[PDB]
Amino acid sequence: KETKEVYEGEVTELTPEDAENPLGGYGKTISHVIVGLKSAKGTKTLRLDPTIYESIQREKVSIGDV
């Protein structure tokens, strides 16, 4: 027996939140990725570690559908 914690819903917009690079650099350095949430009987909005950039590399569903 075990338990897992999962966040799920519908994403209004899938776009990482850019921020200044802590090291002397250029371009865009993501500090957080805002993920929209939408579910029946409960709906919020949250942000995540920009490491999911590789996770969002291949989903092939829609623009934040489920």
Partner: peptide, 23 residues
């Protein structure tokens, strides 16, 4: 050393309002 925590929390708090689909 501690001010960045408050800065991040408050900026996330203020960005959570307009991003919320309330209208």
């Amino acid at each position: 050393a501690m001010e960045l925590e408050d800065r991040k929390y408050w900026q996330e708090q203020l960005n959570k309002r307009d991003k919320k689909k309330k209208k």
